[PDB]
Amino acid sequence: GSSSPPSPPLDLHVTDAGRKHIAIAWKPPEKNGGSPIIGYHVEMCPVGTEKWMRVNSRPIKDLKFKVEEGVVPDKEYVLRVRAVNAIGVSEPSEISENVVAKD
């Protein structure tokens, strides 16, 4: 009965990882808040820090993403995803399981 950013993406999980990539997938927000979801953003943070960094250049128009930018081999990360609509940016998803950039 009002207009808001979307609720957060759901069910974020890691599908694959390597020394140079972390592949993730998620499910759409339960609610779009009153205007369609137009994109997703992925953030990455080395575990034990609060140094969240956006790892996509353009809005993601899919429910999966291969993270490559800024991945450091043998570092350990968590990820989170945000949804965007014409009102603004969602709070982030629940964070991912911990993932090491190794094979």
Residue numbers in the entry: 1 to 103
Quote the passages of the study that discuss this structure, keeping the authors' original sentences.
Fn3-3 and Fn3-11 are found in the non-repetitive region of A-band titin near the tip of the thick filament, Fn3-20 is in the second D-zone super-repeat and Fn3-49, Fn3-56, Fn3-85 and Fn3-90 are located in the 1st, 2nd, 6th and 7th C-zone super-repeats, respectively. Structural predictions of the three variant domains suggest little change to the backbone trace of the proteins and that no clashes would be introduced upon mutation. All domains with variants from HCM patients were solubly expressed in bacteria (data not shown), however Fn3-11 Ala16872Pro was unfolded as evidenced by 1D NMR and its decrease in elution volume (and increased hydrodynamic radius) compared to WT in size exclusion chromatography. We also characterised the effects of three further rare missense variants found in patients with HCM: Fn3-11 Ala16872Pro renders its domain unfolded (contrary to the predicted domain structure) but is still solubly expressed in bacteria, whilst Fn3-85 Ser27083Pro and Fn3-90 Arg27839Gln do not affect the folding of their domain but reduce its thermal stability. The negative effects of Ala16872Pro on Fn3-11 are easier to rationalise as it renders the domain unfolded, though soluble. For two variants identified in congenital myopathy patients, we have previously shown that missense variants that render the domain misfolded and insoluble when expressed in bacteria also do the same when expressed in cardiac and skeletal cells, giving no reason to suggest expressing Fn3-11Ala16872Pro in mammalian cells would “rescue” folding of the domain via chaperone-mediated folding.
Titin is a protein expressed in the skeletal and cardiac, or striated, muscle of vertebrates that plays various roles in muscle structure and function. Encoded by the gene TTN, titin spans half a sarcomere (the basic contractile unit of muscle) and has various functions including preventing sarcomere over-extension (Gautel and Djinović-Carugo, 2016), acting as a molecular ruler for thick filament formation and as a hub for numerous signalling molecules (Kruger and Linke, 2011, Linke and Hamdani, 2014). Fn3 domains are only found in the A-band region of titin, where they are arranged with Ig domains in a pattern termed super-repeats, which themselves are repeated. Fn3 domains have a characteristic beta sandwich fold, with a core of hydrophobic residues as the “filling” between two beta sheets that pack against each other face-to-face.
